[PDB]
Amino acid sequence: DRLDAALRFQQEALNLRAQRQEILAANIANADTPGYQARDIDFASELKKVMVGVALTLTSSHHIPAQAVVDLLYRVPDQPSLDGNTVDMDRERTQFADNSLKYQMGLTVLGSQLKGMMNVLQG
């Protein structure tokens, strides 16, 4: 559908921001686990990958339709801890706040596009 193509980029950006938000909050929650590595995703490359499948064929009514079913990069440690935990509070707190801001911005842009498509139709 053409409607999907217009809203594909913002939807994928919003979903990627939510996933990275979950990853950052997991990094915050597991700050005290000894031996836990701080993981993160490269937002731009994954957004390229998602932006850049074959529903199985249903011959009749009984035939069952096809059933549907990111890469994590390690953060470079800054300070060496003794328990092997590489999670840094300041870095991930700033990243968490930034991801929240960008999620809000994506919501704003997507809502503006939908509202414009709506006022085009209203009449």
Binding site: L56, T57, L58, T59, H63, A66, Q67, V69
Partner: protein, 50 residues
């Protein structure tokens, strides 16, 4: 062989005067993968060994 008049026979017949109509449907079994005909197949396999 027996001769004219040296044989007598009589026949009785139970007949069928009942109108019957029948429709039969048969499906060939496809439980064996060798004789199974397929149109679409989705096989998702995952093995996360730790």
């Amino acid at each position: 062989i027996v001769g004219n008049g040296n044989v007598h026979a009589q026949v009785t017949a139970q007949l069928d005067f009942a109108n019957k109509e029948q429709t039969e449907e048969h499906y060939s079994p496809n439980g064996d993968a060798s004789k199974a005909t397929l149109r679409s197949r989705q096989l998702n396999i995952s093995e996360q060994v730790g």
